[model samples]
Target: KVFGRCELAAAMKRHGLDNYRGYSLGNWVCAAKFESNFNTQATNRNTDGSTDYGILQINSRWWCNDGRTPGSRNLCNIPCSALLSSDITASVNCAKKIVSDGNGMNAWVAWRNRCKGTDVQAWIRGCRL
Candidate 1:
């Protein structure tokens, strides 16, 4: 569905993510279902005005920088920002990076690990190099 679609393929290629969709479809779907029910444009604000956004429920102020702040606007192209974006590949790879960090997945990583279960490869099913 994603590869044959020119616009989506272009977008994925622009992000250097190419074919990760096929590989990560199930995990991505499951992750989003667990997070925010696959909502890409979701946002919530704290009393202090910090926010969380997108399917991954990334925090705007804490994770991506408040959109109201200077130089903020879906900074997902950057390593940190990319990890927080709704993009499937960026989010998963970011989690992997966090897993490699200190050799453990942290709170969020732990969550994904639990959701993914023992068959890690099956979680990222249909994926390839």
Candidate 2:
């Protein structure tokens, strides 16, 4: 809820996400659309006994601890709630780490299902970034 698509794109460029880990702003924008519809407070319960958090829909199973879970990988060393805020700094940093872990954007199911091989430039169409 922090920004519309265009604003998000501009913010992302400011954050240097365009060429982050070889991922373009288009990739991030398209993935965000399908993952959380640009909603920072978004959360989803997964059938796999875990949850997804924030604009990126980062998984609780491997990324962050949800507290209710007895054990979590917490590779990001962050609380899941931190990602649910309108300020996406923590979420975006965690995502950069996840991408650096060699998964790339493929770590996100939405990226694979909705963005991969698609004409992702449309995600940032007309954005001033």
Candidate 3:
């Protein structure tokens, strides 16, 4: 959802999601394209100026509020938790934690098998953390 590769890469690495390159990146891009239109700066409002931002669309209120640094929390933060905990690296890990039970990208295996030949539903089902 960023405008360039370097910025995107930085976001990814911060979440401990380095391995999320190539096919994984492509898959994520495809998903985000539909989810948030690749808008890194995009944020949702809550009647207040507080917002959610970035490609993964992290909610700033839940993420940056507690006076904690980015990547400071765990997976419950969703877009915020992982990104705050470790940046992009942690983001991917947190996602995997959600669906793969903390097994990480290995969860992609099910996605490949059930999802690759079908629809997002396959990945959603197999990858549901």
Candidate 4:
């Protein structure tokens, strides 16, 4: 699904991504803008020879092992293709384990380049919980 900024916000929030440990709802909203522009079917290839899947562009090497990434270390453990659907649930589920290490959210240059000190509250005001 293609999502409006707030539309993605509401979805991400409902699925428990709000104020995630190393990030905030605003941070996620910002990342989605640059990452895939909220496209649920987004898939981009990385220099490391892995593909990124879904809204947040989750990586196959870590989060989306289709028994391909060394030992199939699919930390998220959801089928990699599940992210191709319109629903954002798996994206949220994928990101949950991501923030625990405090590096995944930052892994997105998408989030790093834009979300740091921006007016993210204004972004979420479009949803307001």
Candidate 5:
């Protein structure tokens, strides 16, 4: 599922990305925009052999278990495949747990390379609340 910009923003804020773990909702929106282009089914296999799954491009090496990453912690306690779904409930909840564990928004390189230090607010321009 690909989300519209404002649609993604509103969904994010509703799922507690607003001020969770000291990161703003816009930053999260911007990160997803660049990482997966707001597409829930996105996936990328890293050169290191780990895979990035879903809109957040969550790494299989650390967060989720892909049964392929040799020593993954599966800290999110979810299957990497599960992250790629139409409903974002699992993704959002796992992301909250990710930051809650102190990984911060920098866990995704896309955020730092593109979303970070930018006018992320523009990503949420038409979304109220």
Candidate 6:
């Protein structure tokens, strides 16, 4: 696990994510909470045969390659395993790229389901981000 909610917010802000890509820090924090519960080593196999990796749960179809998955675009040109580290640097950069690609946090189903239009201040209520 990389961070608790408060620390996650502070870390994200330290990485310039407090209000990055036009979204609030609370939004990212909320998404991370539901996506992987802040666990950097998290992975999920999707019913569609795609796998999600790391804190942002980035999919193998576009962002990273797991090698086993054929037809992976690997637009991020990064190994899926690289995202599963506690460092969080590459994960944050890839997430920023995803948002910049026009997907926003909507790329994460968890964000759309749990964070969209919700008050997420509780995710970082005690943090000084």
Worst 10 residues of 5 by lDDT: 98-107
Flag clash pairs in model 6: none
Backbone clashes, each candidate: 1, 0, 24, 0, 0, 0
**For model 5, how does the per-residue alpha-carbon lDDT over 9-88 read when each residue is reduced to its tens digit?**
88888877887888888899998999999999999999999999998888898889999999777988999889999888
Error of 2 at 12 (Å): 1.4
Q: Report RMSD (Å) for each prediction in the order shown.
A: 7.4, 1.1, 9.8, 1.9, 1.2, 1.1
Worst 10 residues of 3 by lDDT: 120-129
Tens digits of lDDT, candidate 6, 1-129: 767888888888888777787888899899999999999999999877889999889999888989867787788889999999888888888898898887677888999999998998778887775
Quote each prediction's TM-score. Answer: 0.41, 0.94, 0.36, 0.87, 0.93, 0.94
User: What's the distance in Å from true for residue 44, model 2?
Assistant: 0.4
Candidate maximizing lDDT: 2
Residues 1-129, model 3: lDDT tens digits: 243444444454455443443234434533434434555544455444545444544445444443433444433444453343323454454454544444433333333443344443222232212
Candidate 2 per-residue C-alpha lDDT over 1-129 given as tens digits, one digit per residue, 9 for 90 to 100: 657999888877877788799888999999888999999999999887899999999989989999765576999999999999878888889989988987688899999999999999999989887
| Each prediction's whole-model lDDT (CA) | 0.44, 0.89, 0.42, 0.81, 0.87, 0.87
Candidate 1 lDDT, tens digit per residue, 8-108?
A: 32333454443342333344344444555555555566556656555555544434544464434443433334444445565544434333445342324
- Model 4 regions more than 4 Å off: 67-72
Report how far off residue 86 is in candidate 6 (Å): 0.8
Ranking by lDDT: 2, 5, 6, 4, 1, 3
* Candidate 4 accuracy as TM-score: 0.87
Residue 55's lDDT in candidate 4:
88
Q: List the residue pairs that clash in candidate 4.
A: none
Pairs in steric clash, model 1: 23-127
C-alpha lDDT (0 to 100) for residue 45 of candidate 4? 80
Instruction: List the candidate 3 regions with Cα displacement exceeding 4 Å.
Output: 5-23, 45-53, 58-87, 101-129
Error (Å) of candidate 3 at residue 37 is 2.8
